[PDB]
Amino acid sequence: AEGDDPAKAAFDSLQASATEYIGYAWAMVVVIVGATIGIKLFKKFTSKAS
Protein backbone atom coordinates (compact mmCIF):
# COMPACT_ATOMS: atom_id res chain seq x y z
CA ALA A 1 0.00 0.00 0.00
CA GLU A 2 2.43 2.71 -1.14
CA GLY A 3 1.77 5.25 -3.92
CA ASP A 4 5.55 5.48 -4.39
CA ASP A 5 6.12 1.97 -5.80
CA PRO A 6 5.44 -1.14 -3.71
CA ALA A 7 9.15 -1.40 -2.84
CA LYS A 8 10.55 2.15 -2.91
CA ALA A 9 13.36 0.58 -0.87
CA ALA A 10 14.85 -1.39 -3.79
CA PHE A 11 14.14 1.61 -6.02
CA ASP A 12 16.88 3.42 -4.06
CA SER A 13 19.09 0.29 -4.14
CA LEU A 14 18.58 -1.26 -7.61
CA GLN A 15 18.76 2.34 -8.91
CA ALA A 16 21.68 3.23 -6.65
CA SER A 17 24.07 0.54 -7.74
CA ALA A 18 22.85 -0.02 -11.32
CA THR A 19 24.80 1.05 -14.44
CA GLU A 20 23.25 4.00 -16.35
CA TYR A 21 23.29 6.85 -13.94
CA ILE A 22 23.98 4.10 -11.35
CA GLY A 23 21.61 6.02 -9.06
CA TYR A 24 24.51 7.67 -7.32
CA ALA A 25 26.31 5.08 -5.25
CA TRP A 26 28.99 4.20 -7.84
CA ALA A 27 31.12 6.66 -5.86
CA MET A 28 29.31 8.49 -3.08
CA VAL A 29 28.44 4.98 -1.81
CA VAL A 30 32.03 4.29 -0.70
CA VAL A 31 32.52 7.96 0.19
CA ILE A 32 29.85 8.26 2.89
CA VAL A 33 29.85 4.61 3.85
CA GLY A 34 33.51 5.38 4.42
CA ALA A 35 32.57 8.02 6.99
CA THR A 36 29.49 6.17 8.39
CA ILE A 37 31.16 2.74 8.64
CA GLY A 38 34.37 4.64 9.46
CA ILE A 39 33.51 6.52 12.64
CA LYS A 40 31.01 3.67 13.10
CA LEU A 41 33.19 0.54 13.38
CA PHE A 42 35.82 2.83 14.95
CA LYS A 43 33.82 4.69 17.64
CA LYS A 44 31.33 1.77 17.74
CA PHE A 45 33.19 0.13 20.65
CA THR A 46 36.93 0.72 20.15
CA SER A 47 36.84 -1.78 17.26
CA LYS A 48 33.84 -4.10 16.81
CA ALA A 49 32.25 -4.38 20.28
CA SER A 50 35.03 -3.90 22.85
Side-chain angles (χ1 to χ4, degrees), residues 22-41:
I22 176 141
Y24 226 50
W26 93 116
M28 296 257 113
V29 82
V30 175
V31 171
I32 172 151
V33 170
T36 325
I37 296 294
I39 191 138
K40 170 82 227 179
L41 247 150

Side-chain angles (χ1 to χ4, degrees), residues 2-32:
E2 228 89 72
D4 197 6
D5 318 318
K8 73 219 259 166
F11 242 45
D12 287 68
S13 240
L14 67 93
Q15 299 300 166
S17 253
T19 162
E20 32 258 297
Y21 46 87
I22 176 141
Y24 226 50
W26 93 116
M28 296 257 113
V29 82
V30 175
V31 171
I32 172 151

